[PDB]
């Protein structure tokens, strides 16, 4: 119950114009109103002197304390609920599972079923707190259309959940245009408002971008636009405190495997887990740096009833 | 009857310029108009402020719902009609046949008659819904010119269909230039508009590319151009919801068999089935990962009257 | 005990208005009152004739001597207490550690754990003068939220300090808006007044700026605003004489690795150490020019209990 009910603010010019400001593309949550810069406050059809101060001062979501709260975060950070891999080995290498309030990626190759791996968690997300789940509704928002509800139905059987219930609990977009990607997120923001939505697979986030822009070296701007989309996801992170696990594509360096797709503005915070497919049905997935464990490795195999333990 | 009749939109500036926008290289289907990014909307001689908003807003093909429709896809995906191999074994390994609305490939070697195997389905495509067919007219658009209508005529006899009718139902291009490949697709788009065309063998799609470009290491750009062509095929996928089965060439790794021809931008979604020719007349064809079955194998032999069952 | 107790000035119009002038956004320390330009003195709601003269003349913090004190600085500069790296090698390359009364930066790539490296010192800062510490409370004020108190707790074990005490000693902000960055600093200024706060990791200082402004070439002004923020940090430097270590992001030059993020107005004063990650767990960090040693290099590896020595 993170959000301070969108425009919880009673006043500070809450009369129609401010409500229209929220009713605009502008994010509606308390956090959004508060987090925003003045550029953005004066971005769209509101009176800059009065509005900014009023809105900014008014929220006092604190926000202000900022550099306050020395090792109080330790009392908090501990409380952050960390999701469940479904390989015992996987979870050990994750050291507490894939985590909410971080944008966490996977550096996959071809054939490596990272598509497959991601779709699986989107089921565990549904499970109770004590069974390693987030007891929330769930975003997989796919740009390849790598989406098989059929495979997800198998996961239900494995983890003892009512099929039709589980499928109804998480919801999905094919969204082709590079601009559409940006667009989609804003309405998620709206969708996030209405109930507790828990964990999110944009998949792959890079893939719609790979092509359909990147005509050689008019790329300065490509990488600019990704930023915007990437910052928004971090905005989405703070707002609702939802897990964002975003899928990448490695693209060869021919001077093997490769760097994760499109390089530099994939920023430090987004914690990144790379999958490298191996002997027989087994596949191996070895965390590149996050803060977690400074590094580490570990295999596992995809199983008809979900990505699981190295057992045959 | 997927397409919303090209420019179904009555207005939103439909006056001559918009019609000329569609009458341009720009795709004409409702989906095309809607799917496109603004880069592309502002790609060619239209006024960016007015046009984009008008066209984009107007379509409302929804499009917008995107992350909506939680396990509603299950009600839909089920309805997707999945084509017929003609080896009972083949179909069992396919677990419902080669599927429409996906770009599905085959990783063939030399002598492996994958050329042959592909031409066969292009007949079953013609068959009624209940006999495993798609009741659609059909694209084989070959760059090797590996095209024998004679062999296809044999398939008719096997599957009890009127010869001259069947041959008239599917149609073919030799198209030599790497640029011609891209070009050809756009007019298909036009050809797709005019009637229900069902399943498509571009064959081999890589082969015209293999040479006639790839002068060593000015390949960054080779792999770029393939992308464009590959994205367009996925665009063609959404548009008409037609099966795209694209044929590859294996190319040795001398460090056996081999990786499918030109590597990385062959993307996860395109589901890939590899053929490996074997004892006597028999040949074996063992699905590399798609979502279908996480993996699995199975032989079969080419028979004078089509690719068939392992029976002698 | 650098600060002359904010408004140490007994008179010089200290009656209510001057106190309100200090009680304003305007910095409160003796140094702030003194250092300020008249533009800024006449910036906010004071009488320009009387106020300026009174305040300016009154401080006489000397200030005035300026070009005085020929190599007396040598008697002083020597006394400046210089913090402790925790790699013996690191400290040798630093030639006395990361230094207070300078804004010192680190030019990091992805995966290079500079995030990690910075969080570590924020512990040594706590240590006694003789053990290489600053015996002060500490600012890490993070914009990525790259903050793991958990990892910091490990540092305590390594350097034999009471866990809960150490964590209570240093304090942290996630602060998203580009304008918020500027805002946060002013209250630090207030927080700096109240006790001896010793060393400061703004982290990364560039990263909130990377995006969320820099829409192409309305950038002249971006770089202006950074200046302001950067000058304030130098203002903060003189005031309390506290170490400012600010983390950067390298941003590729595609005409490798890269220039530090956002170019020109990163000024000469900020002494800069760039980290370049290497063989296995090891990482190498090779001082770009400051005055220190005109250049030089040196590796080291991250160790579960802190960034440390080349030992296995």
Author numbering:
A (entry chain C): 644 to 955
B (entry chain D): 956 to 1267
C (entry chain B): 332 to 643
Give the exact sentences the study uses for this entry:
RAD51 bound to adenosine triphosphate (ATP) arranges itself on ssDNA into a dynamic, helical nucleoprotein filament—the presynaptic filament—that invades duplex DNA to search for a sequence homologous to the ssDNA tail.
Here, we have used electron cryo-microscopy followed by an image processing technique that couples maximum likelihood single particle processing methods with helical symmetry software to calculate a three-dimensional (3D) model of the human RAD51 presynaptic filament to a near-atomic resolution of 3.5–5Å, revealing previously unrecognized structural features. The overall architecture of the human RAD51 presynaptic filament with 6 protomers docked into the EM map when viewed perpendicular or longitudinal to the filament axis reveals that like RecA, human RAD51 protomers form a chain that encases ssDNA as a 1-start helix to create the presynaptic filament. Our model for the N-terminal region of human RAD51 fitted to the EM density map of the filament shows a bundle of four α-helices (H1-H4) packed around a central core, with a further α-helix (H5) projected N-terminally. The fitting suggested that, just as in the RecA filament, the presynaptic human RAD51 filament engages the ssDNA backbone, exposing the nucleotide bases for homologous pairing reactions. ssDNA within our fitted model for the presynaptic filament lies close to the filament axis, and most likely binds the inner surface of RAD51 protomers via the L1 and L2 loop regions which encircle it, with each protomer making three contacts with ssDNA. Moreover, our model with fitted ssDNA suggests a stoichiometry of three nucleotides per RAD51 protomer in a filament with pitch 103Å, incorporating 6.4 protomers per turn. We also carried out 3D classification and refinement with imposed dimer symmetry; again, no observable widening of the α-helices was detected.
